[PDB]
Amino acid sequence: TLEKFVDALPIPDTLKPVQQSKEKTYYEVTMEECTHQLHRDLPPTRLWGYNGLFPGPTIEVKRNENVYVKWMNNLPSTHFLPIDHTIHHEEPEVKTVVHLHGGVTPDDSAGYPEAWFSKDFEQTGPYFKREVYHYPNQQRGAILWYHDHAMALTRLNVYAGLVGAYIIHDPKEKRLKLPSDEYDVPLLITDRTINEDGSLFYPSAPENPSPSLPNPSIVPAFCGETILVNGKVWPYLEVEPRKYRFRVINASNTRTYNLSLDNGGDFIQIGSDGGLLPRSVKLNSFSLAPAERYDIIIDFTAYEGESIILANSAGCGGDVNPETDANIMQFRVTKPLAQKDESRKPKYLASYPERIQNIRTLKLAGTQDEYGRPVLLLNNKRWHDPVTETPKVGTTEIWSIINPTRGTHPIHLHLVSFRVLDRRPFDIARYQESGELSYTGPAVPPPPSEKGWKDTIQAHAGEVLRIAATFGPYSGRYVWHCHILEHEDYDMMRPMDITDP
């Protein structure tokens, strides 16, 4: 297999505005098919990249900065990854739309799966309204990320390389003196399988297919043989012996990580999806499902000279392999100090996170299609079925998510962030047989990591997860879905209409 830790970690350049004034910041980002080397020992790989880059450029904005991004499709008219036409029913083959994940945006700038467009906007989906997206950024400082969200193609377009980081900086947080600038580094983690000729591999069918099954066929999960951070296989990063802030983003299709440091040292978590936690949290390890973000500090001060592996204990389709997917990247504490470390790891970060208008019971279920494939469904509805999740703007609801399946689903709501209330185990067999919910244990409050603001949340097997969200500030057409892209595309995604009575 590919030799670990021979390439330096790329750090995406920060995007520069096409035009900027005190009143408006205007960016242009074009999707392009490009070639990039993923590892010292591979031929260059054909990829799709925002501005031809994988990951795309990091976008940095201030809270309340009035930002517009014209996302453009300049991609080939044919895909290079296997499209399954059976999963969705004259349209272009390559459809794209950019979703600012965690963004608080009007609905027509949110990247709705049916607001897609082909090259040069020649054809546009049924809910397309605009070319230039508006991001008012009137929301908490946080780590966001952007990625393709096109109907029935998300797993493919994201796997092709269409992901990037988007950081909101709230100037009110500057006084905390968290590690900043060169000492504040995003880590976009994406697992991939790569052929010997350097081409991306994505499966065209499940294992040992019926013959029979459409070809290509969607698969219900994807586990890559190799781990990349910031577009490089198993990279190293030379760090100074001092505190760093890392914006850890899981940009993988299916894979969940469980991260630790191989010297047994601690992370300090300072932030979750929705921004700074009320208090910093000392952690030895953490799980990180698709689309979750952990904003962390690692203090290398006492580790000068050392090589420390960011390790992973979570398997994907099997036990983790010590020589491969057990590794993420390697820190080498060998960079000389550019200056005194004047950063801080404060205990007190932010304030702690209303009438309950509605309690919504939701189940994670599904059925089998005519080919015998599993179709994952929220409340046994298709995407296309009339909308049922219709919160009223400005009101708070509790959503109670029942998971009687065998696996965890990272459930994501667009627009809002939410609080995690609790998780409670139930009798799966009794639920499947009668629809009756019978608890087998008391409710468990969230771990400290989940006591702030979240937008993507692990709903574990045989549990009811309860979250609470206030729906706003915008009314309109949004989405909620599982963020395992293989599940999202078939068909674990539903409209979420926030209404204005």
Ligand SMILES: [O-][O-]
């Ligand atoms: O967010 O998909």
Ligand SMILES: [Cu+2]
């Ligand atoms: Cu997302």
Ligand SMILES: [Cu+2]
């Ligand atoms: Cu989202």
Ligand SMILES: [Cu+2]
């Ligand atoms: Cu799922």
Ligand SMILES: [Cu+2]
């Ligand atoms: Cu989404």
